Amino acid sequence: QIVYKPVDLSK
Amino acid sequence: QIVYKPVDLSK
Amino acid sequence: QIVYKPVDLSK
Amino acid sequence: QIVYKPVDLSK
Amino acid sequence: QIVYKPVDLSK
Amino acid sequence: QIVYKPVDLSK
Amino acid sequence: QIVYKPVDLSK
Amino acid sequence: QIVYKPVDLSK
Amino acid sequence: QIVYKPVDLSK
């Protein structure tokens, strides 16, 4: 189960 | 189960 | 189970 | 010649 | 000639 | 000629 | 404003 | 403002 | 403002 958010600036 | 967030500035 | 956040300045 | 497999869980 | 496998749990 | 595997736990 | 060039061999 | 060039061999 | 170039051999 995979999470890949290399440039995360999310609120 | 994987987390990869190398540039995380998220709120 | 993996964590990789090398530039984390998240709030 | 390019290899880019950032989240590799292959058998 | 390039190899980039930052998360690698492959068999 | 390049190798980059910062989280390698491959078998 | 975002730059993401993970394998850059550009001239 | 974000810069991410992990394998940069550019000229 | 972020800079991330872990394998920079650029000219």
Swiss-Prot record, chains A, B, C, D, E, F, G, H, I:
**Compartment list:** Cytoplasm, Cytosol; Cell membrane; Cytoplasm, Cytoskeleton; Cell projection, Axon
Residue(s) of cross-link: Glycyl lysine isopeptide (Lys-Gly) (interchain with G-Cter in ubiquitin) = 5, 11
Q: Where is this site: Not glycated?
A: 5, 11
- Description of post-translational modifications: Phosphorylation at serine and threonine residues in S-P or T-P motifs by proline-directed protein kinases (PDPK1, CDK1, CDK5, GSK3, MAPK) (only 2-3 sites per protein in interphase, seven-fold increase in mitosis, and in the form associated with paired helical filaments (PHF-tau)), and at serine residues in K-X-G-S motifs by MAP/microtubule affinity-regulating kinase (MARK1, MARK2, MARK3 or MARK4), causing detachment from microtubules, and their disassembly. Phosphorylation decreases with age. Polyubiquitinated. Requires functional TRAF6 and may provoke SQSTM1-dependent degradation by the proteasome. PHF-tau can be modified by three different forms of polyubiquitination. 'Lys-48'-linked polyubiquitination is the major form, 'Lys-6'-linked and 'Lys-11'-linked polyubiquitination also occur.
Q: What residue intervals traverse the membrane?
A: none
Partners and quaternary state? Interacts with MARK1, MARK2, MARK3 and MARK4. Interacts with PSMC2 through SQSTM1. Interacts with SQSTM1 when polyubiquitinated. Interacts with FKBP4. Binds to CSNK1D. Interacts with SGK1. Interacts with PIN1. Interacts with LRRK2. Interacts with LRP1, leading to endocytosis; this interaction is reduced in the presence of LRPAP1/RAP.
What is the associated disease? In Alzheimer disease, the neuronal cytoskeleton in the brain is progressively disrupted and replaced by tangles of paired helical filaments (PHF) and straight filaments, mainly composed of hyperphosphorylated forms of TAU (PHF-TAU or AD P-TAU). O-GlcNAcylation is greatly reduced in Alzheimer disease brain cerebral cortex leading to an increase in TAU/MAPT phosphorylations.
Role, per record: Promotes microtubule assembly and stability, and might be involved in the establishment and maintenance of neuronal polarity. The C-terminus binds axonal microtubules while the N-terminus binds neural plasma membrane components, suggesting that tau functions as a linker protein between both. Axonal polarity is predetermined by TAU/MAPT localization (in the neuronal cell) in the domain of the cell body defined by the centrosome. The short isoforms allow plasticity of the cytoskeleton whereas the longer isoforms may preferentially play a role in its stabilization.
What is this protein's record name?
A: Microtubule-associated protein tau
Species in which this protein is naturally found: Homo sapiens
Gene assigned in the entry? MAPT
Q: Which residues of the full protein are shown?
A: 624 to 634 of 758
